[PDB]
Every structure is written in C-alpha cells, then in structure tokens.
C-alpha cells in the first residue's frame, strides 16, 4: 500500500487537534502530571522500539506499532487496557499489516518476558505476566477502536524522496531518519502529516550539521509556519531528553499511573 | 489487565451481526478467503440485500488483516466497498458487510458455456476490470489473485452492470507463466496476464488455460500455456533463463512440441479474428514475457474501447438480466 495521503483514514480521521487531544488526557492528568504523562509516553515508545529490536522487524513495522499505541491513547485512559499489554499486542498487529507475518505464541512472549527483563528492570522488578489470550484479546479491542484503520503513512518514505532531490542522501540522510525515530517521543504522529515531519527533521539535520538548504527549502511552497512548529517541537524534545532520566523515575511514574479496575 | 468499566461499556455498545441481520441458512459462496451470506437487516430500516462475509479461522489472519487494512484506503466504483467490520468477541470470528452484487463472472460464463456473451457487455466487463485495477495499481496494490469468482457484477437497483473486483489476500489457470517457473515477488504484469486469461475466457465461454487438477512448478499448467501459446523463443522472453525453474523447463520441455502451436490458431478455432480489435488487445495482455506486458492504463486507452461499441457503464445495458439469482448452499 502506497496511495494518497489526503484520502487516507491516516489524514481523515488521525490528524487531530491539539487541544482535542489534551481534553482527552485529562482523565490520566488526576494522577500523573502533564511533564509525567510524556516520560510515560516516550518510556512505552522505547518499549516498543526494544520489543521491534528483540523481534528483528523493520523500523516501518516499529513505527506503525507506535502510531497504533499513541492512537488507542490519544481515545483511552491508561487504566482502559494495561500499556505492558498494548505494547506487545501493537507490535504483533502492526507485523500482521506491514506484511512481516505472524509472529509466534512463543516468539511474541518470549520477545515480551526477555525485553522487559534485560532492558526494563529498573521500572519492571515482576516478569511479564501476560501470555497469548491476553495478545489476542487485547488485538481484538485494539482493532475494534481504531476504527479498523490499520494503513499507517511514516516520515521515512518521504524523507528518503527529499534527501534524493537534494543529492545530498549520503551527508544528512543517517542524521534526519535518527530526528524521525525521535519524533515517536512526541505526539507529531497524531498531529501533522508525515511528509511535513519529514522536512521538519530535515531542517534539524541541515542545521546541526550546518548545510545552506535555504534554497530547496523556498521552492518547496509547504506551508512553512507548521513546518516551524514541527521544528520548535523537535527542538523540545531534545530539551526534554537531557532533563528526564528514564531509568531513574519510570519506576514512580508507572505507580502514579492509574491501573485497571477489576469485577465486584 | 483490562478495565471492567470499559470492557462493560464496550459489550453494552457493540453492534453484534446477529443482531443486525439475518443469514442464517443464507450460504452463497464457500472458499479460502472464508463464507458469504445473502444477509437482510433485521431492524426493517432496508430491504436491501447485504453480503456477510465470515473469514476462515478464530482471530484476526494474515487473510483478514490484508482485506481490513486495504479495503478501509480503497474507494473506487469499480473495487468491492466494505462498509462495516463485526469483531465477534464470543467465537473471534471476523465478518465483513458490503452490498450485495447479485452475479459474478464464474455464474455469467458458466451460465453460456452451459447453453452450449454479447460482445458488448464483453468490453464493458474488461474497461471495468482494467479500471479498478488500474485504481489499485496506482495505489501500489496488487490482486495477486484474480479470476472470474473474484469480478462480481450488481444486479438490479442504483448500481446495475457495475463490476465490483472482490477478495483482498487449486487451479492455476490465470496465474502467470513466470509464477509458475519459480518467480519469488508478485508483480503488476501477473494480475494483467489474469485480466488476459479472463478476456480470452469472456470472448470464448472456456477458460483459455484449463488445465486437470506445493512447488511453484506445474508441468500440466505450463504445457497448457504451451499447446494454447506456443513455446516461447529466446527473442520473445529473454530472461527465461534467470528463473529457478528454467533448468527444470529445459528437462521436462521440446520446442518442437508446440510448434503449431500460436494464439492466433487457437482464438481463430472459438471464433475469434486475428485481424479483430480484441485479438490484438488479448495479445497484449497474454505476453509470456512479463516486461513485455501491456500496463492496465495502456490497456484502457486501447483503440477496441474506441470500436463500436462504446464500453457502458452498465455492463447489461439497461437489457433484461438472464442469469439467474444465486442459490443458497
Ligand atoms: C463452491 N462454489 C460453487 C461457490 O462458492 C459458488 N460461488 C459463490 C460465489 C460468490 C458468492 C458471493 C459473492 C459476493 C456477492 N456480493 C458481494 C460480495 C462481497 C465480498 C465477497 C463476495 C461477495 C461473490 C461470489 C462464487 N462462486
């Protein structure tokens, strides 16, 4: 699948509005504060990131995962579906899609257990508890409340057409598609098209490593004031970054998050 | 795990298909991709008929995945149009609702080889199934398998004669010769030679490469091309020698065999005019090598579009339907 973005369920349902998305976050934002709430995210984003490592899938296939966690997120409350259990389920739906295949019962578990105890510890002392019809019920309500959109539009594409009308793939190409697997720390996915990140992160790799793309930048005729607002956010995230030490707080922050409520 | 708020919420407020319609005993086709029902809602709202499409197997398939994923993008008048997906927590089965198309091109052909096609309602059935492909070509989507059960045609209400290509994922009858010789990849110019297969099988009333029923090499099927075709020279298909299979070609294989063997022979025997718009079309389409394969938009601006007459948009042209309903099995 490769078609046209502005008649994509990706443009005409899953670009949202900002302040749409904060109204939403809200009912988690009793417990955790705004600052935690994204740690919370960037931490399951990682999450993710290591289980697509672990299981030897593409970035595309790690990147449609995230989309699919942030998207469930973006509608429910943390406490709606456990995320220990989201990430995993979003991984083995998005390798169904991406055409990757099925990943085994025993893969997909093993994937999950080992990730968690070799790269989580200091925020998971319990091994995963969950096993296949925990996936595979999880899969169910995942695909039920995305509205069945499972066709997922990345940066990576675009940002590769852009650094090859550059003539400049081999310099800012490593740099720029590092920036995008870093946008998945942000809510960018959910709020501007793929293609507009793209340039945004091209931007960033042109500055860091000082390149004049001033040129190719103005006969582009994007609308360049959400570019700019793609840029500052990057830029924020990096900010974010040196002040959060993961592996220090995440153990707190998972405490604070509101968990699933069980039967009478 | 879960929230039991939630999962509360979400019972209460999910549309179950037995609930929604009616189908049972309802069976009309039976497959791979799973069964269809000719359901109607049960809440009076339409007499519409409605196709109920329950996948084969508990959760969600490769199969099942593939066809939400695509057909959830795909909007075009001449590709199959989902309109709802049922996720049946109690068994985990899949079903799909879309519209009901009253025929097929399995039933319209086994209907006239029977009685043994208006050569109008021909060239409407092919500038239909060139343009849905077309569509999901541009779209970088591939059939993968298309044969005449997969081209459905509405019958009567606000779509009649519209061809509706089905399924999104035994006989090997319109699979390409470079299949069948080992090619790995599923290409755009395997789904053209199925459009041919499919053309020459409209103009004829049987299916150009029939052929008596796990490798990716069939000598029954390739000796079929073969005797249909004729064996193909060096100059014809050049990369021959760069299939898995070629080796295996050269073992089991003679040129000689198929030496009076040609397409112009075969079609001229059902009756089909080498010198017709149509035969040079169908030549195009049925090209052995496949980079030497007409495109699906190549095809459509083909001057037998041009030929009179003039491809409708209703396949039947307003005449009275003669192929029956579908029974339930
Ligand atoms: C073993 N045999 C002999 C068979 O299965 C006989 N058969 C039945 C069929 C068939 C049955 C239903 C549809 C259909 C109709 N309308 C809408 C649809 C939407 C999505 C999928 C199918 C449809 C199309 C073909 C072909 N062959």
Known sequence: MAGNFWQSSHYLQWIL???????????????????????????????????????????????????????????????????????????????????????SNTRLIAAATSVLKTRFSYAFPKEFPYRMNHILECEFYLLELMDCCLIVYHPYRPLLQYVQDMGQEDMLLPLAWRIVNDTYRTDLCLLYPPFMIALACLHVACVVQQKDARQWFAELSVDMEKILEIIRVILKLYEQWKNFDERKEMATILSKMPKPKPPP | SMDYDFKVKLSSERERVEDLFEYEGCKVGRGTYGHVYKAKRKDGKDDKDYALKQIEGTGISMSACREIALLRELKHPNVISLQKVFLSHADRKVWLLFDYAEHDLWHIIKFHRASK???????????????????????????????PANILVMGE?????????????????????????????????????????????????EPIFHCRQSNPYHHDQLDRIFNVMGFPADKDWEDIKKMPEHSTLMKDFRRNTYTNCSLIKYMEKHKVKPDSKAFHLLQKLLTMDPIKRITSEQAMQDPYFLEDPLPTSDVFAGCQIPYPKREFL
């Open chain 2, 157 to 205: 209400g606000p779509e009649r004669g519209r061809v509706k290509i089905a399924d999104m994922g035994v006989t090997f009858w319109y699979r390409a010769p470079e299949l069948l010789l080992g090619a790995r990849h599923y290409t755009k110019a395997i789904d053209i030679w199925a459009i041919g297969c499919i053309f020459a099988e409209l103009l004829t009333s």
């Open chain 2, 117 to 147: 096609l208006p050569r109008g309602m021909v060239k409407s059935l092919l500038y239909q199934i060139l343009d849905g492909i077309h569509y999901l070509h541009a779209n970088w989507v591939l059939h993968r398998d298309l044969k």
């Open chain 1, 17 to 103: 509005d900002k302040q749409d998305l904060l109204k939403e976050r809200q009912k988690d934002l009793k417990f955790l504060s705004e600052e935690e709430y994204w740690k919370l995210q960037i931490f399951f984003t990682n999450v993710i990131q290591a289980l697509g490592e672990h299981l030897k899938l593409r970035q595309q296939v790690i990147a449609t995962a995230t989309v699919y966690f942030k998207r469930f997120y973006a509608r429910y409350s943390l406490k709606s579906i456990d995320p220990v259990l989201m990430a995993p389920t979003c991984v083995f739906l998005a390798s169904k899609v991406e055409e990757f295949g099925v990943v």
